[PDB]
Amino acid sequence: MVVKVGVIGTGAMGRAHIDRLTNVLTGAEVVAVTDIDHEAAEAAVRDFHLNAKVYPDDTSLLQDPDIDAVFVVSFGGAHEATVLKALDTDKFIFTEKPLATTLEGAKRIVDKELTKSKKVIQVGFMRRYDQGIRALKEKLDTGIIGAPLVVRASHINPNVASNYSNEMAITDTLIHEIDEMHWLLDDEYTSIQITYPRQSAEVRNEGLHDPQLATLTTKKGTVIQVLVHVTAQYGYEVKLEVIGETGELQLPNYGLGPILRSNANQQTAVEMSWINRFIQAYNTEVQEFIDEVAKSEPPVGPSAWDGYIAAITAAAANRSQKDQETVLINVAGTPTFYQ
């Protein structure tokens, strides 16, 4: 039997999740939608040929007793309240990142979900589902390179829109690494420091520093060095290297396109779209959520606790962006509810 889904927020990513649920993946149907732009909601039903109700708001959607799960894909600042409303129902909840735009909001969601008899929230950190990143983590966990001492990573994007701010370097971009590293390493963060190399001439946006260097430390002492470079021009690329006691692991060459020998060069195309880079991870992530719902079991993907960790770390990083000083992080031990 089919997992009946409501979607709250039918913009870009909302529509892409609808497409996933409707066209790409198995076992679900979108039967309700809402958007504060009623017209956007109506277009979704129309464009994807859904047999679905358009609700005027989130509150009314959430009272529909036939909806098994909700996807929250509205503006980030709007997640917190909506998630708290859905927690007054029994529905499963897939929220895109962030769990909340403040760490205070995140803690509320955590505290409330912790009052429930079982976990219902999955947060949209898709990196964990990417085949390559997953395969590296698995290899690391065999012990073949010993303990992880240093991690070096890059988050490379070709160009940004007019609306991209200095803070979004953290909240939209580094956030992926923020969720990824503690999971990768099975460790907790103790600090974050953002430093600014010389400013790129390619930056067109007021207040945006690019590139940015993020250094994180963990409780076991692993140091993580992330390069964030969002006006890099050449392509979209995610790089990851783990330095171990006895060896190293890194992500392979990405891409399926051919190797061209021509005009005194050998070359391969580089991905230009993060959308395309992570198509697989999005599919895998959402299919897993649906599969869990379908058997009336809690999600096994990133949780509200993960969302809270990310929120705390992002806020520490936003603080660090002001003065380039190291900010400490102390995250509480995970409630057993979240293991």
Ligand X SMILES: NC(=O)c1ccc[n+]([C@@H]2O[C@H](COP(=O)([O-])OP(=O)(O)OC[C@H]3O[C@@H](n4cnc5c(N)ncnc54)[C@H](O)[C@@H]3O)[C@@H](O)[C@H]2O)c1
Ligand Y SMILES: O[C@H]1[C@H](O)[C@@H](O)[C@H](O)[C@@H](O)[C@H]1O
Q: Are 328 and 219 in contact (CB under 8 A)?
A: no
Q: How far apart are CA 242 and CA 147, in angstroms?
A: 10
Give the CA count within 13 Å in the CB-facing half-sphere of 94.
33
Q: Which stretch binds ligand Y (CB under 6 A): 49-57, 106-114, 168-176, 185-193?
A: 168-176
Phi-psi region of 310 (alpha: psi -120 to 50; beta: other; left: phi over 0): alpha
Residues that bind ligand X (CB under 6 A): 8-14, 34-37, 40, 58, 73-76, 78, 96-97, 124, 126, 172, 274, 278
Residues in contact with ligand Y, total (CB under 6 A)?
Answer: 6
Binding of ligand Y at residue 274 (CB under 6 A)?
A: yes
What lies within 8 Å, CB to CB, of 67 at 6+ separation is 4, 5, 6, 31, 32, 61, 91
Query: In terms of CB distance, is 171 or 217 closer to ligand X?
Result: 171
Quick one: what does residue 58 bind among ligand Y, ligand X, a second copy, none, with the CB cut-off 5 to 8 Å set by partner type? ligand X
Q: Would strands 189-195 and 248-250 be described as parallel, antiparallel, or unpaired?
A: unpaired
Structure tokens at 331: 């995250």
Q: How far apart are CA 220 and CA 160, in angstroms?
A: 35
- Least distance to ligand X, CB of residue 73, Å: 5
- Least distance to a second copy, CB of residue 147, Å: 7
Q: Which of 68, 80, 113, 172 binds ligand Y (CB under 6 A)?
A: 172
Q: Are 48 and 19 in contact (CB under 8 A)?
A: yes
Quick one: what does residue 285 bind among ligand Y, a second copy, ligand X, none, with the CB cut-off 5 to 8 Å set by partner type? none
Binding of ligand Y at residue 337 (CB under 6 A)?
A: no
Work out whether the CA dihedral 143, 144, 147, 149 comes out positive or negative: negative
Give the CA count within 13 Å in the CB-facing half-sphere of 261.
0
Quick one: what does residue 157 bind among ligand Y, a second copy, ligand X, none, with the CB cut-off 5 to 8 Å set by partner type? ligand Y
Query: In terms of CB distance, is 4 or 176 closer to ligand Y?
Result: 176
Q: Which stretch binds ligand Y (CB under 6 A): 60-68, 172-180, 239-247, 307-315?
A: 172-180
- Least distance to ligand Y, CB of residue 225, Å: 18
Query: In terms of CB distance, is 115 or 262 closer to a second copy?
Result: 262
Query: In terms of CB distance, is 47 or 248 closer to a second copy?
Result: 248
What lies within 8 Å, CB to CB, of 197 at 6+ separation is 211, 212, 213
Binding site for ligand Y (CB under 6 A): 157, 172-173, 176, 230, 274
